[PDB]
């Protein structure tokens, strides 16, 4: 509560975005989020390793 | 939307910290990733900003 | 080094806070002491800096 | 940990450097560091009185 009321949510380091295009599925594009640390809502969020996420491809016409 | 007019979604949820945006090209494996994460400013950084302000007003004079 | 070229040692250890530098003249009891300690900036000081920025942009206009 | 992540190391007050030249030894110059308060690696360092330090004289040719 004190941290959020003083400074709000902010990043400390890391959490860079990189595209890889891994072929897990032809209808998705893989994205890698690099390891980092941040304080969200006053709670620390330390991730030691990168997280992989995938976005669906755009087909709307 | 078309690439000239596409914009990221607008959000105001306090519970989430934005790390960046991922743009997917229309019907392609390529994707553009940019990081817009809010990052802290330590006391040294703020002092450097203050020094920059001092230089700015000196140049103004 | 000679007085025209003498510089303090370079350090990047996070565990130590630099309080200043002491310069000793060659073969003399006299010494020059200067403080370069990193110091905080209270929210009042940051508001004053913001006001100074406001004045700078007003003068630019 | 939280303080160092948010703001790093900084000084609050005090810790001024003053040269006195006390004759404890002919090969040294005495320097006084005034009392002060600081946060190093997030840990408060509150000193009630000054500390005497000595720097060796420069004889390198």
Automatic annotation (TrEMBL), chains B, C:
The chain holds residues 426 to 486 of 1152 of the full protein. This is Uncharacterized protein.
């Amino acid at each position: 509560e004190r941290t959020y009321d003083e400074s709000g949510s902010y990043k400390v380091n890391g959490f860079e975005l990189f595209s890889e295009g891994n072929a897990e599925d032809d209808d998705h594009v893989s994205v890698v989020v690099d390891a980092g640390k941040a304080y969200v809502k006053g709670f620390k969020v330390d991730k030691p390793v990168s997280t992989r996420i995938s976005v669906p491809k755009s087909y709307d016409l | 939307n078309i690439m000239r007019l596409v914009t990221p979604p607008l959000n105001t949820d306090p519970e989430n910290l934005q790390l960046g945006t991922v743009t997917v090209l229309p019907d392609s494996d390529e994707a553009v990733c940019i990081s817009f994460a809010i990052t802290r400013l330590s006391m040294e950084d703020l002092q450097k900003v203050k020094t920059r302000v001092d230089n700015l007003e000196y140049n103004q004079a």
